[PDB]
C-alpha cells in the first residue's frame, strides 16, 4: 500500500495518439497484487471537450541492477523510431483500460496480476487534433486501489501540463531525422520554421542534408506541408551525400517582409564531419560555402541560391558559417545574421554579418570572443547588439556588446555568469515595449537550463536588458532528454512561439503567454 506518481513536465502533442500524463511505480508488490482501479481528477477550469481519450498501460517490471527510483523501464513513446513516433510502442506497453468521454473524475481498471517487486503503469492522454496550443491540463492521481484497499500515494504530480505540436517527426517524408530549428514571424503574422532534413541518419554535414521549411498562417495550430527552401542535389555530378546544406538561420527583413535563409553548403568531404574537415580556400572544392535564398511571397516559394562566400570569408579560415537559428532587422533597417569561423589554427570564433542594402551585400568585421561557436544576436537598445554565444569552456553563455556592427566588442555584465549551458545552441530575441502586452522592453532566451546534457528546455525573460534573469520569469517546457536546439519568435502581442528539438518530437512548436513568463 505505497505507490509513487510522476506528472512529467513534457509537451502534450495535439497530433499524437499517446502522450505520457502520469508514470507510476509500485515498488514493493507481492506476486498476484492487482491495481483494481485508479482515479484521475482534472482542474475545474480544464477544457475536457478537447480530451479525446485517457488510457492506462502496464509496462511490466524493472531489471535487478537498475535501482528502485526510475518511473519507467524504457521510453514509452519514441521520438526517434521512423516506423512509429505517434503512439506507445505496443511491445513495451499493454492497454489495461480506456475512457473516450472524459469527466473531471475518471476511473481506470486492470485485472493484471503484478510480479514481486517493481511494477510500472502509466496514463496516456490523447487530445483532439484541433486542441488549442494555449490549453493547459491540471491532473492528479487522487486514488489507487490494490487488493480492494486504497494505497498511500506519493510523488510530485502538481505540474501544469502544456500542449505542443510535432511539426516534424523522425521518418516524416522519408527523412531519418530533422535538426537545427530556426523560427521567424513575417509582417503578415505567418510563422516560418527552418531545419536540416537529414535523410540518411542524424549526423551533421557532410551528408545528404537539405534545408526544409514549415509555414503556419494560424499561429501554429496548422503547418503547411514541408517546402525545401534550399538543396544542391547532384551538383557537378558529385553524390547528394557529398552536396549537403544545413545549420540554417532565417530572418525577416521587417522593412520589405522579404524572408532570408543562410546555410552552409559542403561539396565533397567524403562522409566525414565538416567541423574538422572543412579546409582553407574559397572554392566549393576547397571549403564550405555560405549560401542564401529569399522569399518575397511570405515564405511560400524560394529564390535559387546565391553564393556570398567571396564577400565575407577570409581565405585562411578553415570554415565560415551562419550561427543556426535566426537573424534580426535592427530599428535602422540593418539586416544581421550571427556567424562563426574556424581560423587557420582551428580556433572557433563567434561574430556577426550584416547588410545595409536589404541583403544585396554582406560584411563581417572582428570576432567577439575566442573559442565560441553558435551565437544569436538581439538589439537590446537602439544601435546596441548583444551577442549570446556557445562557449567551449563550458558551464555558461558568453555575452558581448557591439555599437559598431562588430568592429569593436565589450564584455556584458552577464558574461559567463547569468545563463547556465552544457555547450549547446541557445535562442535570444528582443521585444519592444510597444510590441507586447507587458508594455516593457523584454529579452527572451531559451536553451537547455543545465550545465550537463540536453534537457530542462526553459524560456527565460529579462526586464533589464539581460543583466538579470529572475527565476520567477521562467517557464520549464521539457524536463526530459533531447538534442537541445531551440528558436524563439513572438507570435503576436501576448504570446511567444518556440520551435525546438524536444523529448517528444525532432521539431516541436509550443506557444506561451507572456503573462505566464512575467508575473
Ligand X SMILES: CC(=O)N[C@@H]1[C@@H]([C@H](O)[C@H](O)CO)O[C@@](O[C@H]2[C@@H](O)[C@@H](CO)O[C@@H](O[C@@H]([C@H](O)[C@@H](O)C=O)[C@H](O)CO)[C@@H]2O)(C(=O)O)C[C@@H]1O
Please, which residue, 264 or 511, has the CB nearer to ligand X? 264
The residue within the footprint of a second copy, chosen from 45, 83, 152, 225 (CB under 8 A), is 83
Distance CA 400, CA 395 (A): 17
Distance CA 215, CA 167 (A): 10
Among ligand X, a second copy, none, the one that 74 touches (CB under a kind-dependent 5 to 8 A) is: a second copy
Nearest CA-CA partner of 209 in 155, 246, 160: 246
- Return phi, psi of residue 435, to 5°: -105, 0
- Contacts (Cβ under 8 Å, ≥6 apart) of 177: 80, 170, 196, 198, 201, 202, 506
Does 239 interact with a second copy (rule: CB under 8 A)?
yes
Among ligand X, a second copy, none, the one that 238 touches (CB under a kind-dependent 5 to 8 A) is: a second copy
Q: Are 175 and 198 in contact (CB under 8 A)?
A: yes
Distance CA 253, CA 260 (A): 7
Please, which residue, 347 or 463, has the CB nearer to ligand X? 347
Please, which residue, 246 or 323, has the CB nearer to a second copy? 246
Interface of this chain with ligand X, residues 130 to 189, rule: CB under 6 A? 180
Nearest CA-CA partner of 350 in 329, 320, 380, 307: 320
Q: Binding mask 13-42 vs a second copy (x if CB under 8 A, - otherwise)?
A: ------------------x-----------
Does 54 interact with ligand X (rule: CB under 6 A)?
no
Please, which residue, 483 or 509, has the CB nearer to ligand X? 483
Query: Smallest gap, in angstroms, from Cβ of residue 308 to a second copy?
Result: 22
Whether 374 is catalytic: yes
Q: Which of 62, 126, 374, 379 is catalytic?
A: 374
Please, which residue, 112 or 396, has the CB nearer to a second copy? 112
Does 151 interact with a second copy (rule: CB under 8 A)?
no
Nearest CA-CA partner of 354 in 373, 328, 332, 335: 335
Look-up: residue for cell 555575452?
Answer: 399
Nearest CA-CA partner of 421 in 399, 438, 440: 399
Cell of 226: 514541408
Q: Which helix (H) or strand (E) holds 56?
A: strand 51-58
Q: Binding mask 184-203 vs ligand X (x if CB under 6 A, - otherwise)?
A: -------------------x
Among a second copy, ligand X, none, the one that 345 touches (CB under a kind-dependent 5 to 8 A) is: none
The residue within the footprint of a second copy, chosen from 17, 36, 202, 240 (CB under 8 A), is 240
Query: Smallest gap, in angstroms, from Cβ of residue 266 to ligand X?
Result: 8
SS (H, E, C) 433-481: HHHCCCCCCEEEEEEECCCCCCCCEEEEEECCCCCCCCHHHEEEEECCC
Number of residues near a second copy (by CB under 8 A): 46
Distances (CA, A) of 163 to 46, 117, 461, 490: 12, 34, 20, 17
Please, which residue, 125 or 262, has the CB nearer to ligand X? 262
Among a second copy, ligand X, none, the one that 373 touches (CB under a kind-dependent 5 to 8 A) is: ligand X
Does 122 interact with a second copy (rule: CB under 8 A)?
no
In order, the DSSP letters of 83-123 are T-SSS--TTT-EEEEEESS--SEEEEE--PPPPSEEEEEEE
- Count the residues in the chain: 519
Does 91 interact with a second copy (rule: CB under 8 A)?
yes
Interface of this chain with ligand X, residues 336 to 395, rule: CB under 6 A? 373-374
Interface of this chain with a second copy, residues 290 to 319, rule: CB under 8 A? none
Does 247 interact with ligand X (rule: CB under 6 A)?
yes
Cell of 289: 560555402
Angle in degrees, CA 340, 195, 450, rounded to 5: 65
- Contacts (Cβ under 8 Å, ≥6 apart) of 139: 7, 21, 22, 40, 41, 42, 43, 46, 125, 157, 161
Please, which residue, 193 or 348, has the CB nearer to a second copy? 348
Distance CA 281, CA 314 (A): 8
Count the Cβ atoms, other than its own, within 10 Å of residue 197: 27
Please, which residue, 273 or 356, has the CB nearer to ligand X? 273
Does 64 interact with a second copy (rule: CB under 8 A)?
yes
Among a second copy, ligand X, none, the one that 371 touches (CB under a kind-dependent 5 to 8 A) is: none
Please, which residue, 18 or 247, has the CB nearer to ligand X? 247
Does 417 interact with a second copy (rule: CB under 8 A)?
no
Query: Smallest gap, in angstroms, from Cβ of residue 93 to a second copy?
Result: 6
Distances (CA, A) of 411 to 29, 272, 368, 379, 425: 58, 36, 9, 16, 20
Interface of this chain with a second copy, residues 166 to 205, rule: CB under 8 A? 174, 199-200
- Return phi, psi of residue 491, to 5°: -80, -50
Does 204 interact with ligand X (rule: CB under 6 A)?
yes
Among ligand X, a second copy, none, the one that 374 touches (CB under a kind-dependent 5 to 8 A) is: ligand X
Could you list the active site residues?
374
* Residues at the site binding ligand X, with contacts judged by CB under 6 A: 180, 203-205, 247, 273-276, 373-374, 483
Residues at the interface with a second copy (CB under 8 A): 31, 58-66, 73-74, 82-83, 89-94, 112-113, 115-116, 174, 199-200, 206, 208, 234, 236-242, 268-272, 276-277, 279, 285
Amino acid at each position: 500500500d505505497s505507490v509513487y506518481v510522476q506528472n512529467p513536465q513534457i509537451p502534450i502533442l495535439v497530433d499524437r495518439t499517446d502522450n505520457v500524463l502520469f508514470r507510476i511505480r509500485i515498488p514493493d508488490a507481492t506476486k498476484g497484487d492487482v491495481l483494481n482501479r485508479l482515479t484521475i481528477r482534472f482542474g475545474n477550469e480544464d477544457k475536457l471537450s478537447e480530451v479525446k481519450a485517457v488510457r492506462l498501460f502496464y509496462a511490466g517490471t524493472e531489471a535487478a541492477t537498475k535501482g528502485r527510483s526510475r518511473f519507467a523501464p524504457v521510453t514509452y513513446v519514441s521520438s526517434h523510431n521512423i516506423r512509429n513516433t505517434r503512439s506507445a510502442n505496443p511491445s513495451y506497453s499493454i492497454r489495461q483500460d480506456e475512457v473516450t468521454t472524459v469527466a473531471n473524475t475518471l476511473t481506470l481498471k486492470t485485472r493484471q496480476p503484478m510480479v514481486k517487486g517493481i511494477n510500472y503503469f502509466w496514463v496516456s492522454v490523447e487530445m483532439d487534433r484541433n486542441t488549442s496550443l494555449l490549453s493547459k491540463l491540471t491532473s492528479t492521481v487522487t486514488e489507487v486501489v490494490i487488493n480492494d484497499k486504497p494505497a498511500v500515494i506519493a510523488g510530485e504530480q502538481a505540474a501544469v501540463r502544456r500542449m505542443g505540436i510535432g511539426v516534424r517527426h523522425a521518418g516524416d517524408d522519408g527523412s531519418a531525422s530533422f535538426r537545427i530549428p530556426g523560427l521567424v514571424t513575417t509582417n503578415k503574422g505567418t510563422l516560418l520554421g527552418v531545419y536540416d532534413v537529414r535523410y540518411n541518419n542524424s549526423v551533421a554535414l557532410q551528408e545528404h542534408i537539405d534545408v526544409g521549411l514549415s509555414r503556419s498562417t494560424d499561429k501554429g495550430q496548422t503547418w503547411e506541408p514541408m517546402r525545401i527552401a534550399m538543396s544542391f542535389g547532384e551538383t557537378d555530378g558529385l553524390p547528394s551525400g557529398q552536396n549537403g546544406v544545413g545549420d540554417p538561420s532565417i530572418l525577416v527583413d521587417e522593412r520589405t517582409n522579404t524572408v532570408w535563409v543562410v546555410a552552409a553548403w559542403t561539396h565533397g568531404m567524403g562522409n566525414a564531419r565538416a567541423w574538422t574537415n572543412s579546409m582553407p580556400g574559397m572554392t566549393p572544392d576547397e571549403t564550405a560555402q555560405l549560401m542564401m535564398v529569399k522569399s518575397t511571397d511570405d515564405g511560400r516559394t524560394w529564390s535559387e541560391s546565391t553564393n556570398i562566400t567571396s564577400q565575407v570569408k577570409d581565405p585562411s579560415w578553415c570554415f565560415l558559417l551562419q550561427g543556426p537559428g535566426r537573424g534580426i532587422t535592427m530599428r535602422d533597417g540593418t539586416l544581421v545574421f550571427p556567424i562563426q569561423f574556424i581560423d587557420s589554427l582551428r580556433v572557433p570564433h563567434a561574430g556577426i554579418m550584416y547588410s545595409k542594402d536589404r541583403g544585396e551585400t554582406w560584411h563581417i568585421h572582428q570576432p567577439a570572443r575566442t573559442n565560441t561557436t553558435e551565437a544569436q544576436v538581439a538589439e537590446v537598445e537602439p544601435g546596441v547588439l548583444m551577442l549570446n554565444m556557445r562557449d567551449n569552456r563550458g558551464g555558461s553563455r558568453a555575452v558581448s556588446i557591439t555599437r559598431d556592427l562588430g568592429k569593436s566588442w565589450t564584455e556584458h555584465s552577464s558574461n559567463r555568469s547569468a545563463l547556465p549551458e552544457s555547450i549547446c545552441m541557445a535562442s535570444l530575441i528582443s521585444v519592444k515595449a510597444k510590441d507586447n502586452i507587458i508594455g516593457k522592453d523584454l529579452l527572451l532566451f531559451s536553451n537547455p537550463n543545465t550545465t550537463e546534457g540536453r534537457h530542462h528546455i526553459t524560456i527565460k525573460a529579462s526586464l533589464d536588458g539581460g543583466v538579470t534573469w529572475l527565476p520567477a520569469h521562467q517557464v520549464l517546457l521539457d524536463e526530459e532528454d533531447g538534442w537541445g536546439y531551440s528558436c524563439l519568435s513572438m507570435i503576436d502581442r501576448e504570446t511567444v512561439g518556440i520551435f525546438y528539438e524536444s523529448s517528444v518530437a525532432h521539431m516541436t512548436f509550443q506557444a506561451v503567454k507572456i503573462k505566464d513568463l512575467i508575473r
